[PDB]
Design an enzyme around this catalytic site. Structure first.
Site, PDB file in Angstrom:
ATOM      1  N   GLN A  35       0.813  -1.232   0.000  1.00  0.00           N
ATOM      2  CA  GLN A  35       0.000   0.000   0.000  1.00  0.00           C
ATOM      3  C   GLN A  35       0.835   1.264   0.000  1.00  0.00           C
ATOM      4  O   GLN A  35       0.435   2.260   0.571  1.00  0.00           O
ATOM      5  CB  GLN A  35      -0.934   0.018   1.193  1.00  0.00           C
ATOM      6  N   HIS A 122     -14.478  14.849   2.945  1.00  0.00           N
ATOM      7  CA  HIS A 122     -13.556  14.592   4.058  1.00  0.00           C
ATOM      8  C   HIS A 122     -12.110  14.950   3.738  1.00  0.00           C
ATOM      9  O   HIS A 122     -11.679  14.996   2.542  1.00  0.00           O
ATOM     10  CB  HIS A 122     -13.668  13.116   4.492  1.00  0.00           C
ATOM     11  N   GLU A 162     -24.402  10.828   6.394  1.00  0.00           N
ATOM     12  CA  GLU A 162     -23.944  12.150   5.980  1.00  0.00           C
ATOM     13  C   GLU A 162     -23.159  12.875   7.077  1.00  0.00           C
ATOM     14  O   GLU A 162     -22.191  13.586   6.787  1.00  0.00           O
ATOM     15  CB  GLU A 162     -25.106  13.053   5.533  1.00  0.00           C
ATOM     16  N   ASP A 206     -16.308  11.847  -5.574  1.00  0.00           N
ATOM     17  CA  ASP A 206     -16.215  10.747  -4.648  1.00  0.00           C
ATOM     18  C   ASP A 206     -17.289  10.891  -3.573  1.00  0.00           C
ATOM     19  O   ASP A 206     -17.785  12.029  -3.301  1.00  0.00           O
ATOM     20  CB  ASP A 206     -14.845  10.874  -3.959  1.00  0.00           C
ATOM     21  N   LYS A 209     -22.917  10.136  -1.531  1.00  0.00           N
ATOM     22  CA  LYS A 209     -24.024   9.816  -0.604  1.00  0.00           C
ATOM     23  C   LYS A 209     -23.691  10.272   0.821  1.00  0.00           C
ATOM     24  O   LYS A 209     -24.564  10.271   1.700  1.00  0.00           O
ATOM     25  CB  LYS A 209     -24.367   8.314  -0.571  1.00  0.00           C
ATOM     26  N   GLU A 230     -20.046   9.300  -7.516  1.00  0.00           N
ATOM     27  CA  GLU A 230     -19.995   7.934  -6.941  1.00  0.00           C
ATOM     28  C   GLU A 230     -21.043   7.834  -5.854  1.00  0.00           C
ATOM     29  O   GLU A 230     -20.843   8.354  -4.740  1.00  0.00           O
ATOM     30  CB  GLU A 230     -18.617   7.653  -6.338  1.00  0.00           C
TER      31      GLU A 230
HETATM   32 CA    CA Z   1     -20.239  13.884   5.353  1.00  0.00          CA
END
Ligand code: CA
Ligand SMILES: *[C@@H]1O[C@H](CO)[C@@H](O[C@@H]2O[C@H](CO)[C@@H](O[C@@H]3O[C@H](CO)[C@@H](O)[C@H](O)[C@@H]3O)[C@H](O)[C@H]2NC(C)=O)[C@H](O)[C@H]1NC(C)=O
Length: 476
Positions: A35, A122, A162, A206, A209, A230
């Site tokens: 990674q 984020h 959310e 990205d 939802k 997405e």
């Molecule tokens: Ca959020």
């Protein structure tokens, strides 16, 4: 570029760290389990544009460009781009501002588009949610910009989805409070200026939802280009309504039944047939969605079965379905990695052969789609129509009368028998000659409208009227 400009496009999605190094090595190590950054760059992509465009793609989607958290964490480095910290700087691993501008320029000189992946939901942080040092984020350098720290517990509860945070206490993803005007205004300024500075033609958004719906219209307007979101959910009743707030979404509803139909010789054609119709009638516009069967968040298609005929059929479907086809770097080399990180294999390790079976299949399918679009202004808005199904076969038809592409797909696999399919519903005229454009043979429509389609080796068949191919390079 506008949503209308995007309908005709075909996207090759790649991870910038994993597609092509500046040095062009096809042997440099990239151990997916580690990674870590493997060294892919924007300059690397430029030098392999011929490989991509040779498959008939007209656009690429690259992973996010913003500066990331710098640490190597217990989950590795931010090689994927989804753990940003400074949104006004670029990720130096991939190159400089000048290199990203060079990439957009190079695509434009080829009549291609650049789509860039962006995250609004984020930031990323190396460590526990409780310990986050907010001063490291730019410009969101205060806890006041964020939702209070809690991790999402119940993905059925949309409020939590959310308002609470993704990630965990090893790598936490501090959740921006996208309901605040200062946050909205900052993101809207950012995305408009990002698009302007790098001449970006479209965005893939990205984690849609995870941000409240009333954030998205202003963001899509500020971007000033087509945005495809997405929305990670297979239920069309949950996912398609996001098209009311954003131009398009990835076609996760089709994903599931598409994968199931072809991942084995006993997959359900019924489920796929029905979902095509469900999406056609229930989604604001099926022609603005993005079709895929392989990405960096699910096992690759070949991880389920190594059967090359099955992989050819699902690739054909992706290219010929409503909406914008999206192939994930490696799919064309029959990559077989399972879930993250195993599905982030470096494309360079394949040697980039242009004679692989799937490279040629993808080229042939994009070739006929691109050609058909050039001759039929109705093709991209014409709703794809399933016309036939049996236990092992699905056929569909897209395009204006006299110019329609008719596609017959099989899940019989490489051991499939040789037989003649009596295909009804294709809508051609009696006696019309058609070209099967994958294998370059010809078929003639019967006086009863039926099309006798020679089936063999579980192979997909893609039909188009022969007279309409005059002057093209297809099957020449
Ligand atoms: Ca959020
Ligand atoms: C694309 O390039 C432009 C032009 O260089 C960048 O514009 C710059 O945007 C920054 C960030 O908003 C502005 O920063 C400053 O912020 C403080 C707020 O504390 C403000 O009071 C200052 O007046 C100033 O706006 C900066 O002024 C601006 N620079 C210029 C020359 O216009 C833009 O950020 C770039 N976009 C991306 C995503 O890279």
């Amino acid at each position: 570029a506008t949503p209308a400009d995007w309908r005709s496009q075909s996207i090759y999605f790649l991870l910038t760290d994993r597609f092509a190094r500046t040095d062009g090595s096809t042997t440099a190590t990239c151990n997916t389990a580690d990674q870590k950054y493997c060294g892919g760059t924007w300059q690397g992509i430029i030098d392999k544009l011929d490989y991509i465009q040779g498959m008939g793609f007209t656009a690429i989607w690259i992973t996010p460009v913003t500066a990331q958290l710098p640490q190597t964490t217990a989950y590795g480095d931010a090689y994927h781009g989804y753990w940003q910290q400074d949104i006004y700087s670029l990720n130096e691993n991939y190159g400089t501002a000048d290199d990203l501008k060079a990439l957009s320029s190079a695509l434009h000189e080829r009549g291609m588009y650049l789509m860039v992946d962006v995250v609004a939901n984020h930031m990323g942080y190396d460590g526990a949610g409780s310990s986050v040092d907010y001063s490291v984020f730019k410009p969101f350098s205060s806890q006041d910009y964020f939702h209070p720290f809690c991790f999402i517990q119940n993905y059925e509860d949309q409020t939590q989805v959310e308002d609470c945070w993704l990630g965990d206490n090893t790598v936490s993803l501090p959740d921006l409070d996208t309901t605040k005007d200062v946050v909205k205004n900052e993101w809207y300024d950012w995305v408009g200026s990002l698009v302007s500075n790098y001449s970006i033609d479209g965005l893939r958004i990205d984690t849609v939802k995870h941000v409240q719906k009333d954030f998205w219209p202003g963001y899509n307007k500020a971007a000033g280009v087509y945005c495809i979101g997405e929305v990670l959910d297979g239920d069309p009743a949950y996912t398609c309504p996001y098209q009311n707030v954003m131009d398009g979404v990835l076609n996760y509803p089709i994903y599931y039944p598409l994968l199931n139909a072809f991942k084995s010789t006993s997959g359900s054609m019924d489920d796929l047939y029905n979902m095509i119709n469900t999406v056609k009638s229930d989604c604001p516009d099926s022609t603005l969605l993005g079709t895929f069967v392989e990405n960096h968040d699910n096992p690759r298609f070949a991880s389920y079965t190594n059967d090359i005929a099955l992989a050819k059929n699902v690739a054909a479907f992706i290219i010929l379905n409503d909406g914008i086809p999206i192939i994930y770097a490696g799919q064309e080399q029959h990559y077989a990695g399972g879930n993250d990180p195993a599905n982030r294999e470096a494309t360079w390790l394949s040697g980039y052969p242009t004679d692989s079976e799937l490279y040629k299949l993808i080229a042939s399918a994009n070739a006929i789609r691109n050609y058909a679009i050039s001759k039929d202004t109705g093709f991209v808005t014409y709703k794809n129509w399933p016309i036939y199904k049996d236990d092992t076969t699905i056929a569909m038809r897209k395009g204006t009368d006299g110019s329609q592409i008719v596609t017959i797909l099989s899940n019989k696999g490489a051991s499939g028998d040789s037989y003649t399919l009596s295909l009804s519903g294709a809508g051609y005229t009696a006696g019309q000659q058609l070209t099967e454009v994958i294998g370059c043979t010809t078929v003639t429509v019967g006086s009863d409208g039926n099309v006798p389609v020679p089936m063999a080796g579980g192979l997909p068949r893609v039909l188009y009227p022969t007279e309409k191919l005059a002057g093209s390079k297809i099957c020449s």
